[PDB]
């Protein structure tokens, strides 16, 4: 079982968010750091089952513009697709 934690208050840019994901999901060394690479990693790389715990979501939204929301949507679509992903929003 893989567990990924995001401390929302520590996210100061969309770049922080993809770099926090790279580490926590053990993404490829040349992880593309975009939504397209994120989808491709969730459905063709990452280990499952997966629990993503996203703390301080609102705070992480303040300095990513639409980013935070966009990245969460990808996780949600990966879970619609059939991936065993558990999303915890706090």
């Amino acid at each position: 079982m893989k567990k990924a934690v995001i401390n929302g208050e520590q996210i100061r840019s969309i770049s922080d968010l993809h770099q926090t994901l790279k580490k926590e999901l053990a993404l490829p060394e040349f992880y593309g750091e975009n939504l397209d690479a994120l989808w491709d990693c969730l459905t063709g790389w990452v280990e499952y089952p997966l629990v993503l715990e996203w703390r301080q979501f609102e705070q992480s939204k303040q300095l990513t513009e639409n980013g935070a929301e966009s990245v969460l949507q990808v996780f949600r679509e990966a879970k619609a697709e059939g991936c065993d992903i558990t999303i915890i929003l706090s």
Binding site: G32, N34, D36, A37, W39, D40, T43, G44, W45, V46
Partner: protein
Amino acid sequence: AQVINTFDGVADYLQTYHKLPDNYITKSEAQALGWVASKGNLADVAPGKSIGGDIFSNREGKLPGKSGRTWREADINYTSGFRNSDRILYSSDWLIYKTTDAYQTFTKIR
């Protein structure tokens, strides 16, 4: 048939026959035969096969959009082990692109 998994071979094949070469299987089919992505066992459970054929959602909107246009992607230069950063993107009206940097940038090749 012999494996066709190079940009030019796949692009030519896509435009000439309007389908992917026989050595491509979607993520679901690969999973139905035993593929576990983090194990990187695709060549074990599906010898000579590559992941390709799934809908590509153009999440960042870098490829050109159009009423009626959907996209698909396929893995390029893959043989075995964990997946790489090379993909070929082909649309419903047969426009062909590629990426060699995990979807960061794209090049029109057809």
